[PDB]
Design brief:
heterotrimer; A mainly beta (about 210); B alpha+beta (about 350); C mainly beta (about 230); B: about 350 residues; alpha+beta; HIV Envelope Protein Gp120, Chain G; 5 helices; about 15% helix; C: about 230 residues; mainly beta; Immunoglobulin-like; 2 domains; six-stranded antiparallel β-sheet; 22 strands; about 50% strand; elongated; binds 2-acetamido-2-deoxy-beta-D-glucopyranose; viral protein/immune system; HIV-1 antibodyomics neutralizing antibody germline binding; Viral protein-Immune System complex; trimeric; 45-VRC01.H01+07.O-863513/45-VRC01.L01+07.O-110653 (VRC07_1995) Light chain
């Protein structure tokens, strides 16, 4: 019924975001903004009318079956997923990624071996911290005795820091105690725009 | 010259001042005698827009019928809070009579005479009348009873068929009798309605064909109500002052619309009801003794179409849509009030 | 002012039922439908049905028929969403929503200007479990320049949420508490770290205070340099 594009828009403040929704059926078309962890907010209804309190830099238009939401002069708080809607049907969403611009900053990287406590309990979690970097894009690659690990780590990232507008990210590699003990070198290799070459932090199991 | 306007209408009827029947009683003081000399004037080369779904005449009828029921029904007890109210509850004489709605000076009612007018949009054949035709204020759910029929084809009325939140009114062009009886003298609340299944299924087939015109060609299927109070999951109506609730599962049988003699719907006369007029419950006395019987014409159907159905190639309709105003809409759709300037 | 007030998050085993309320105010409840919309990962926003307070008429998409029931309590102007036989993929944030335009005589259901805040329902075979809290000890390789990184790993709890503070709230600058991750075990983990002057390591105690209310579990974990 409703096809949105593009899937993701990655833009800086002050730029223009153009979001498309293509319809296949009849009926009034609305746009919603859903910021992370919040309810959706109506932005546009009836293709071009603005909902209560929506700034005028949000505009909806229509060409045949093609509807667009243009967000002029983007702001950081425009971050979120935008959905078009017609009656009960919703498009799949377009993610607009925009944040507070600042200068590029490489992460400071730290690696933490599992605690003796956790090890005693039969599991080993290795943590890699990437502190205070910008922009948000960063890649962590766990390596165990130079073997690139994939699928046995998880990571998450903070929101932009209130003072310095950086991000931080933690990645956790988890092994059984038995598997952890099969290997010596634990490393996390970090790739980021602020670095000319990947940075690796590592430790040898057992020795601090 | 005229323009769309709302104003307070008055009502007229053939009520008898000596009757005990409660609609007669009401109309004897609320209304004047039917226009002894009705005049309808054809307005040459006039096209007018109508919208049955935004028509203050409906609001006004609703107010009157609410008032009629409030002053006429005599429930043994009325529950609203908070408030339990007990009172005498003799059986009443109840049989709706036709009511006409009429404009006061400086206003006129325009009437849409297009044979297949669906209720909204331009009407090419417009006349002006002082009063509407006589409309019986039959309160019922699922099935519209004792109304007018569409002149030509079956008509599907909806403010927007693509909008599943809008009720659909199917206006039949041929009535189908529904004959409801609580036999004389087990269970005195047990009743039933008999419908000629052969006739019914034929009409229902025609209804599915008209719906098919509006919905691509999708397979049209009927299903029972998805939920709701008993007043809307059953066909609910008042026969002889008794509140009937009849199960219409058999009336929407897709197999017989793709095989029947008489369909008999099981009914109950209920003493404990949810009042249509305003939120609240009422309790009535046990059914009156004897044969209780109402033979009514089914003249329309209220439907609600399932949302979310872009997987299927079918459209699913359930009896019931909307609220009692839509009963009035089903008869007032062809009228609008206009002010003379 | 139109307000839609939803009930709180819920956690359910698969096979259970849930019920969510949406208490309305600021308008005549009878006048227009209430809608439920769920936000399930991977599935954007999905309408589950509407309910008209007058008579409780409803409209459910086919995929929810048989498990969804939308009901109301006219006396408290509250709408309810009931869903039975829950499964893992019912995990979602559930919203009630109402159209912008709603009068005594007309409405337009679908321009959802009004949304409840959302109700998280997580459906999982996990049972409540408080976390283990492991140190992320400051080391020589958590130390560069004058600054050290240390933290707590709050592992294997269910359900969300946990909170963590440092030094009972007296340490906030430099603290990063990450979003929890759901492990394949069905338990959550989260990490909280802080950077501190490496000269403070011998003289300032660092304690992470971890609170898991669902299991009524609080932990104060002291985090110290590895004694090596
Ligand atoms: C049908 O919906 C459309 C919006 O797509 C609206 O413009 C129109 O007024 C509706 N029709 C009626 C009769 O309400
Ligand atoms: C209305 O228009 C028709 C042609 O469409 C014309 O024959 C007729 O005379 C017009 N009505 C008048 C002039 O009253
Ligand atoms: C217009 O409607 C009236 C009333 O039904 C009818 O008598 C008349 O023949 C109609 N005229 C046309 C041209 O359809
Ligand atoms: C009723 O309308 C249908 C079209 O919807 C038509 O096929 C049928 O002949 C009509 N029946 C009568 C009695 O007018
Ligand atoms: C009825 O009226 C007009 C015809 O001009 C059309 O716009 C509207 O969609 C129709 N509605 C139905 C339910 O067929
Ligand atoms: C209605 O049904 C009753 C009971 O079967 C029957 O005696 C009566 O003749 C019927 N009336 C009509 C008009 O069909
Ligand atoms: C039932 O309706 C069909 C269709 O009009 C008709 O042939 C038949 O005579 C009816 N049966 C009775 C008992 O009236
Ligand atoms: C109508 O009858 C059918 C079969 O007897 C039953 O399954 C259904 O629940 C009934 N509907 C209502 C609203 O009672
Ligand atoms: C529906 O009609 C078919 C036609 O034979 C019949 O077999 C079936 O019993 C009916 N079911 C209901 C519930 O009406
Ligand atoms: C329909 O009209 C008939 C004949 O006037 C009457 O006997 C019957 O009770 C009416 N039905 C209803 C539900 O009012
Ligand atoms: C129905 O449409 C919705 C919205 O466009 C979409 O998310 C869903 O996958 C569709 N279902 C189908 C095509 O079966």
């Amino acid at each position: 019924v409703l096809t949105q594009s593009p899937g993701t828009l990655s833009l800086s403040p002050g730029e223009r975001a153009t979001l498309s929704c293509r319809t296949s059926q009849y009926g009034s078309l609305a746009w919603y903004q859903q910021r992370p962890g919040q309810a959706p907010r109506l932005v546009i209804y009836g293709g071009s009318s603005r909902a209560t309190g929506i700034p005028d830099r949000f505009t909806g238009s229509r060409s045949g079956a093609d509807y667009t939401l243009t967000i002029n002069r983007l702001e950081p708080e425009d971050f979120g997923i935008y959905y078009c809607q017609q009656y009960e049907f919703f498009g799949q969403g377009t993610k607009v990624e925009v944040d507070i611009k600042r200068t590029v900053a490489a992460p400071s990287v730290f690696i933490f071996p599992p605690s003796d406590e956790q090890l005693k309990s039969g599991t080993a979690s290795v943590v890699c911290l990437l502190n205070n970097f910008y922009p948000r894009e960063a890649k962590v690659q766990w390596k165990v005795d130079n073997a690139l690990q994939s699928g046995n780590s998880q990571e998450s990232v903070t929101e932009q820091d209130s003072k310095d507008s950086t991000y931080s990210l933690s990645s956790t590699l988890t092994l059984s105690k038995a598997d952890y003990e099969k290997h010596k070198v634990y490393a996390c290799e970090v790739t980021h725009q602020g670095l000319a070459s990947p940075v690796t932090k590592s430790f040898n199991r057992g020795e601090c | 010259v005229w323009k769309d306007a709302d104003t307070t209408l008055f009502c007229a009827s053939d009520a008898k001042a000596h009757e005990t029947e409660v609609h007669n009683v009401w109309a004897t003081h609320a209304c004047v005698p039917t226009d002894p000399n009705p005049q309808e004037i054809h307005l040459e080369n006039v096209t007018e827009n109508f919208n049955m779904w935004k028509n203050n005449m409906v609001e006004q009828m609703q107010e009157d019928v609410i008032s009629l029921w409030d002053q006429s029904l005599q429930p043994c007890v009325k529950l609203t809070g908070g408030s339990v109210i007990k009172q005498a509850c003799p059986k009443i004489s109840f049989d709706p009579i036709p009511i006409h709605y009429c404009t006061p000076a400086g206003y006129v009612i325009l009437k849409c005479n297009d044979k297949n007018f669906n209720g909204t949009g331009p009407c090419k054949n417009v006349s002006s009348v002082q009063c509407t035709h006589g409309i019986k204020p039959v309160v019922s759910t699922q099935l519209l009873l004792n109304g007018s029929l569409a002149e030509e084809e079956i008509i599907i009325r909806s403010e927007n068929l693509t909008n599943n939140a809008k009720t659909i009114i199917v206006h039949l062009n041929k009535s189908v009798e529904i004959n409801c009886t609580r036999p004389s003298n087990g269970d005195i609340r047990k009743a039933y309605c008999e419908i000629n299944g052969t006739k019914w299924n034929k009409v229902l087939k025609q209804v599915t064909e008209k719906l098919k015109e509006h919905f691509n060609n999708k397979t049209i299927i009927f299903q029972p109500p998805s939920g709701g109070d008993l007043e809307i999951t059953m066909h609910h109506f008042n026969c002889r002052g008794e509140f009937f609730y009849c199960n219409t599962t058999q009336l929407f049988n897709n197999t017989c619309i793709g095989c029947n003699g008489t369909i008999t719907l099981p009914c109950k006369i209920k003493q404990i009801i949810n009042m249509w007029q305003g939120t609240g419950q009422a309790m009535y006395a046990p059914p009156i003794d004897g044969k209780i019987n109402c033979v009514s014409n089914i003249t329309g159907i209220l439907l609600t179409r399932d949302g979310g159905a872009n997987n299927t190639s079918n459209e699913t309709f359930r009896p019931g849509g909307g609220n009692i105003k839509d009963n009035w809409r089903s008869e007032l759709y062809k009228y609008k009030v206009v002010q003379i300037e | 002012q139109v307000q839609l007030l939803q009930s709180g998050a819920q956690v359910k085993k698969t096979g259970a039922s849930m019920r969510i309320s949406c208490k309305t105010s600021g308008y005549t409840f009878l006048n227009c439908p209430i809608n439920w919309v769920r936000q399930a990962p991977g599935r954007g926003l999905e309408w589950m049905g509407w309910m008209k307070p007058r008579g409780g008429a409803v409209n459910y998409p086919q995929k929810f028929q048989g498990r969804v029931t939308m009901t109301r309590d006219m006396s408290t102007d509250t709408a309810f969403l009931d869903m039975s036989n829950l499964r893992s993929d019912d995990t979602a944030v559930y919203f009630c929503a109402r159209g912008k335009y709603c009068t005594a005589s007309d409405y337009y259901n679908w321009d959802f200007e009004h949304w409840g805040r959302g109700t998280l329902v997580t459906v999982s075979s996990p049972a409540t479990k408080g976390p283990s809290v492991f140190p992320l000890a400051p080391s020589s390789k958590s130390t560069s320049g004058g600054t050290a990184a240390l933290g707590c790993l709050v592992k294997d709890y269910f359900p969300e949420p946990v909170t963590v503070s440092w030094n009972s709230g007296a340490l906030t600058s430099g603290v990063h508490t990450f979003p929890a991750v759901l492990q394949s075990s069905g338990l959550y983990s989260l990490s909280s770290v802080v950077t501190v002057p490496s000269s403070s390591l011998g003289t300032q105690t660092y304690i992470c205070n971890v609170n898991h209310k669902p299991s009524n579990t609080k932990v104060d974990k002291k985090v110290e340099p590895k004694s090596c």
